[PDB]
Design a protein around this ligand. Structure first.
Ligand SMILES: *[C@@H]1O[C@H](CO)[C@@H](O)[C@H](O)[C@H]1NC(C)=O
Lengths: 52, 439, 49
């Protein structure tokens, strides 16, 4: 599981690998309906879900 | 001017900055740190090398009995065993059987392994904030390497500089740390002279050439049965036969902040946290006047398509009219936007582009060009890709992140009930006055 | 970059698609179906001569 920090993984003698996620992108729209939980699921999902 | 700034101590990210010289084109310059290399204070405590049991050739006290003389040896053991009976091809090496006793003595010393095979118990405290930074000053990649202290400014090619010193003085190291030639371990050892028998570092010495050998092997010499003309004895456990198994991961994997390991000497590598002050004076020969700058008019900027990716998923189009030919200081004033380009040659009525991004969808922003403010809008998009193999730059933001139409939606919902509170106010005054209409 | 299209199942009519990555100038490409040959899986029951 990749955090918002990113993750190191090493395997055997070969050099580790460092990984970063994107913004949980492509769950997006605006629409004539709300689609603002969509923009939220871009804009840092599952934290400050409580504010709306 | 002299310009002093403090960049966040963040390994591998290009830091762009403005150097305001009023009456001049402001020297926007790009610099980026490369190494964060700490070296803790050099203080060896003691050594642990592989011992060996030294059993000297014992003393078969034929037809008699002697005493037990004690020498000053680590884990000394001696015993006159009676009732012994020696064997060879001829059987009885002594003449009789009954009166034959035998002295048995043994102890432990160092080995020849200790010239290379050992491990330093070691005391580590405050480190040397050494580092490296590359500045792309005016198409000139100049990379320097020095320690961040505050006084040792180094100067090359019109540029003096003192990096640091480090604010966040966190170290991965503690006081107690044991080191072997390929691996360091920030673990507590027992102190010198305090090794429990059979433990990690139970044999103790200061250096590989110290003649003092603090040892603890709990050894005891048992009785041989009959004719076994040798020294049967207990077990002296070496810590070094299990000097490997307890190790687990080494501190290349226990360190936080992406911090890595350099041996002999042990440098902490690229452990990005905190911030570093850099202060650089360049005189006016690097500063071009605003009147010597081609003044831009017609600041008509826009973007074909932006995308708030990790990399420069926005690239905007500037149509412009400079006065004449010459360089121009292009600059992102806001930390949300990171232009990847320092200064551009501008000619007059012409058009070019700029590579940048933010992390949000609707970035509306004023670029600075030949000391000239220009506003421009940008609808960025959520990027298609999902895994990124590198950290991003402009994404250092907070929560107050502007949007495309949730601006309009929050305007729509603040145009909700507060108007009905104004209605509530008019109902309140109209019910107040009619109650005051009685008298 | 990636471009998923659902063209109608038409033998012998071209299709123009607007392929474009986010950030660059668009492009219009032509694809065309030529044949949709449905091969049934078979088993002989018996013959007659
Ligand atoms: C300067 O260094 C940057 C990376 O810091 C590199 O991308 C660029 O090509 C270099 N340019 C020159 C002129 O050396």
């Amino acid at each position: 599981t990749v955090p918002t920090e990113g993750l190191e993984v090493t395997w055997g003698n070969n050099e580790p690998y460092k990984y970063w996620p994107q913004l949980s992108t492509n769950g997006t729209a605006h629409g004539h309906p709300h689609e603002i939980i969509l923009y939220y699921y871009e804009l840092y999902p599952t934290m400050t879900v409580v504010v709306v | 001017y002299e310009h002093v700034t403090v960049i966040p101590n963040t390994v591998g990210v290009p830091y762009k900055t403005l150097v305001n010289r009023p009456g001049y084109s402001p020297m926007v310059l790009e610099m980026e740190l490369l190494s964060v290399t700490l070296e803790p204070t050099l203080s060896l405590d003691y050594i642990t090398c592989e011992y060996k049991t030294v059993i000297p050739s014992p003393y078969v006290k034929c037809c008699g009995t002697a005493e037990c003389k004690d020498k000053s040896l680590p884990d000394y053991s001696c015993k006159v065993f009676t009732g012994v009976y020696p064997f060879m091809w001829g059987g009885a090496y002594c003449f009789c059987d009954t009166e034959n006793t035998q002295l048995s003595e043994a102890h432990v010393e160092k080995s020849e392994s200790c010239k290379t095979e050992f491990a330093s118990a070691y005391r580590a405290h405050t480190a040397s904030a050494s580092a490296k930074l590359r500045v792309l000053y005016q198409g000139n990649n100049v990379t320097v390497s020095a320690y961040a202290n505050g006084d040792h400014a180094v100067t090359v090619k019109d540029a003096k500089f003192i990096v640091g010193p480090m604010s966040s003085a966190w170290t991965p190291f503690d006081n107690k740390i044991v080191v072997y030639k390929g691996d360091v371990y920030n673990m507590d050892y027992p102190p010198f002279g305090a090794g429990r028998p059979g433990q990690f570092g139970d044999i103790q010495s200061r250096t590989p050439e110290s003649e003092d050998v603090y040892a603890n092997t709990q050894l005891v010499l048992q009785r041989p049965s009959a004719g076994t003309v040798h020294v049967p004895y207990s077990q002296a456990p070496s810590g070094f036969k299990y000097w490997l198994k307890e190790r687990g991961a080494s501190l290349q994997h226990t360190a936080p902040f992406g911090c890595q390991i350099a041996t002999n000497p042990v440098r902490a590598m690229n452990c990005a946290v905190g911030n570093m002050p850099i202060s650089i004076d360049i005189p006016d020969a690097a500063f071009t006047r605003v009147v010597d700058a081609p003044s831009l008019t017609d600041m008509s900027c826009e973007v074909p398509a932006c995308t708030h990716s990790s990399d420069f998923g926005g690239v905007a189009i500037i149509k412009y009219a400079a006065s004449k030919k010459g360089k121009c200081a292009v600059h992102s004033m806001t930390n949300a936007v990171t232009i990847r380009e320092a200064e551009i040659e501008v000619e007059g009525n012409s058009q070019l582009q700029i590579s940048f991004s933010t992390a949000l969808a609707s970035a509306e922003f004023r670029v600075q060009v030949c000391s000239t403010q220009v506003h421009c809008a940008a609808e960025c998009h959520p990027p298609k890709d999902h895994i990124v193999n590198y950290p991003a730059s402009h994404t250092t933001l907070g929560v107050q992140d502007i949007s495309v139409t949730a601006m309009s939606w929050v305007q729509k919902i603040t145009g909700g009930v507060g108007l009905v509170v104004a209605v509530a106010a008019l109902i309140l005054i109209v019910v107040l006055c009619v109650s005051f209409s009685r008298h």
